Amino acid sequence: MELRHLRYFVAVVEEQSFTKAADKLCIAQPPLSRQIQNLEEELGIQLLERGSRPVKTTPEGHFFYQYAIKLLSNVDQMVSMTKRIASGH
Amino acid sequence: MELRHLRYFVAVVEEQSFTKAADKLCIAQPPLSRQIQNLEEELGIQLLERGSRPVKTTPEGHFFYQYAIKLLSNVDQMVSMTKRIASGHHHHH
DNA sequence: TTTATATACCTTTTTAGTATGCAAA
DNA sequence: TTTGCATACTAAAAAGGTATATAAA
């Protein structure tokens, strides 16, 4: 599992659509759909209900989303505070 | 930047060695070295002490290392919890 | 010297892009 | 119908492997 999976999944959940999330991140919709499949096949857990329009998270996917943004918000903290330390000698 | 980069960096710092870390990660040494280089270049900061052999972190790299471990741990915790839920053996309200 | 990391070069794997099918409303 | 996610295929990007040059110890 890479950050790509979280970054993409979060986008899908936030925009409640693959197509809009695709456009938000400036990638094609299919390779986005494939990443979300791979994530789910890796975990062995279905995170989104489909069709169903718009897309909705499953209870598991909801929990996973809530956590994923905590993690991604931390990658931000991590990187930015690292850079702050580099600037200064 | 991806989790693999963190996972690699962590290996190198712990083993204080690219060749040992690469053996543990089951890839060759040259890939590991480039991946680390890429991570450094992508952030634009030096994480490791090149020039000294018992390979050591820079102050920035040290902070980054300590953060990474918490991050990677929370990734495991997320997955572990999600599975617990998904198996329907939740003890989460 | 020896021993470990960086570079050069090539292969394999993964991800992104395009065309299009198919299902939801 | 129109609209949006999925599947099939191709293209590009990125990761990984082997050989070897190079710099610490």
The technique is X-ray
Nearest to A79 among B43, B46, B83 (CB): B43
Distance CA A83, CA A79 (A): 6
Cβ atoms B4, B32 nearer than 8 A: no
Number of Cα atoms under 13 Å in the Cβ half of residue B92? 15
Closest nt by CA–C1' to B19: C4
3-state secondary structure chain A: CCHHHHHHHHHHHHCCCHHHHHHHHCCCHHHHHHHHHHHHHHHCCCCEECCCCCCEECHHHHHHHHHHHHHHHHHHHHHHHHHHHHCCC
Q: Beta strand A56-57 with A48-49: parallel, antiparallel or unpaired?
A: antiparallel
Q: Structural domain tally of chain A?
A: 1
CATH number at residue A64: 1.10.10.10
**Strand pairing category for B48-49 and A56-57:** unpaired
Residue of least CA–C1' distance to D17: B28
| CA–CA dist B79, A84 (Å, integer) | 31
Q: Do B64 and A75 touch (CB under 8 A)?
A: no
Place of tokens 């909705």: A56
Which residue bears the tokens 């890939």?
B31
B78 close to B23: Cβ distance less than 8 angstroms: no
By the 10 Å C-beta count (0-12 exposed, 13-18 middle, 19+ buried), A27 is classed as middle
Residue B68 and residue A78: Cβ atoms within 8 Å? yes
- Domain that includes residue A56, residue range: 1-89
- What are the chain B neighbours of A60 within 8 Å (beta carbons)? 82, 85-86
Chain breaks in chain A (C to N over 2.5 A) after: none
Tell me if A9 sits within 8 A of A47, measured CB to CB: yes
Give me the phi and psi of A49, to 5 degrees please.
Answer: -85, 145
Give yes or no for CB of A52 within 7 Å of strand C. Answer: yes
Cα Dmax for chain A: 56
